[model samples]
Target: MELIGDYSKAFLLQTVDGKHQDLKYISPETMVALLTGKFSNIVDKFVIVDCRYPYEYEGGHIKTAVNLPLERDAESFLLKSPIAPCSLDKRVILIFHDEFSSERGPRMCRFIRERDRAVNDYPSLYYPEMYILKGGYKEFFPQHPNFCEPQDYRPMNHEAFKDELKTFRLKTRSW
Candidate 1:
């Protein structure tokens, strides 16, 4: 997999510069921390934006995370919404549809930063923290019993190998 810039360093820089930079990539552990309110001390001072689709958001998402579909016209929504001024004092956490670690997460971070710079010019948005769940919902949900259930799949027949292979292949593909 391709690595984006040092996410921790980038995040610190953005925070110090008073610029909005979303957390671009995150691991399952990191996500667990955020979701379980372990990050509450920090999160209470910021905003968490969910960049997943409406359907996914409705199904279940980090509680209180506002939906902002990255695939749509995000720029317009950002400008027209309360996210800017309202989220100024808080860190803006951007969560994508668990497919964000690849191009989608990084691309969305760049997009938001560029748009904010272009519009505000002064970088009024400060310390915009971005997070991309390491494996998105697939990894997060399975690990958290409250959000997901563990399933037992025993291969009882010769066809099981083929089925398992198909499942593995599908999981490996990037968004």
Candidate 2:
């Protein structure tokens, strides 16, 4: 309970300043684990926000990921969110990504930060911790085909591992 007070104090002061570099990095492997319920016990709630355009999102994205795109607006998100902004005030994790973590992923984070700054009531309105998949969707899907959308993205070219690839499900596995 004492730790909560310090954390809440930091939230109000965190900004785009070098001090507010709150976004974290998550590996593709770990993300796959998060999506596939490997970490269900440790983490209760989280969501992946794909920052790519609609067509790109349609082409492929993480399992259970939602497409928020970038700030099509400052006051509102582009897609309809199942969770309200107030609901963000928790221990929930939000992983944001794009084709590459190079640009769009970081850009979307700024949007979230800015919005939180404007309306967040600190301890009252919490901001979900942010994470960026290190290499983004291209690297993730190829590395963990088991958690990607086969309907959205084609299977990786394992021409050399044709036999090995065949053994793997090669698509999102059914639970």
Candidate 3:
């Protein structure tokens, strides 16, 4: 099936060859702009899907974003959500807590795009735009220090906490 969007397949292939490990996801600055009012015009035009766990989401997230944790039930929740089946014609932008947490965010983005391609019999029900938070929440939150007070909630100072989480052998596997 033809994927709705052309991915950096060349880049992905190069990584397999050890030519490079660098793959670009969206930048924190761009995310901040999109989340805040700085890019309201373009922001409103696209769907922002936050793929952080519920606990992390309750702590803080891009305002007005819909949450669908990238855990086991992602596919079902996504298909049934307004952002997916209902708003198929709109531009879609998916953001996760952090790219480092789990590979699920990027994987799901590609899955949705490919799913649309497989069902080409139906009108295109997928957005053309997709992105993952470059550093996930690890890098996104620090840029907006005022948003979460250090002691207010979990994942607060998430970057530093990520380090501690790793030290403790906690599930730092995914943000």
Candidate 4:
């Protein structure tokens, strides 16, 4: 992994999938600061992606977060990403998170970044700045409940998500 100079040391992880790269990690506090305009000078806007099932997302999610649980969803989002044509002076950040951000969040970040690289040349990327929410909702909700809708939490292992977990596990096993 390599680290970028600014923005709290953005690290680049090398992926084994065709040797693609992955996004960096950002703390929930930094996310809040970004949302509240602390970094508005550098970032014009940002999109938060909840890498969870629709049921869980509908139940609750960070305010303004879009649900993108599967690789197809990530693909479509990248297809429409505005960062491709824009200059670095105007930055649009993309953040990804799941229940714990261990699997889905990191996977989505790498997936979109790799896809971005496939179309855009190296060093020039669509939505070049992407991030995984460190600790995910599990750590963010308690500290910043006001930023969440409905202010609730449900673990991946929650009884209500048993069937969903099993199905999705099998569905994404190949990845």
The numbered model that scores best in lDDT is 4
lDDT of 4 by residue, 76-140 (tens): 87556544324556566788888875777887777787777777655666566677787888888
Runs in model 2 lying further than 4 Å from the true structure: 1-22, 72-90, 123-125, 151-175
Off by over 4 Å in 3: 1-24, 37-43, 70-78, 81-90, 97-102, 122-125, 146-175
lDDT of 1 at 104: 45
Tens digit of per-residue lDDT, candidate 3, span 1-175: 2232544112110011111123235666666666566644433444455665455566666555556654434555555452532332223444544324445456556666666566454444444455566656555566664543332334533664566444533433344
Name model 4 segments beyond 4 Å from true: 1-23, 81-88, 167-175
What TM-score does each of the candidates earn? 0.52, 0.64, 0.54, 0.79
Give Cα-based local distance difference scores for all models. Answer: 0.47, 0.58, 0.48, 0.72
Error of 4 at 141 (Å): 0.3
Clashing pairs in 4: none
Report the error of model 2 at residue 100, Å: 1.5
Candidate 2 Cα lDDT to native = 0.58
Q: Which one wins by TM-score: 1 or 2?
A: 2
TM-score, cand. 3: 0.54
Quote the positional error of residue 121 for candidate 2 in Å: 2.6
List the RMSD of every prediction in angstroms: 9.4, 11.0, 7.8, 5.6
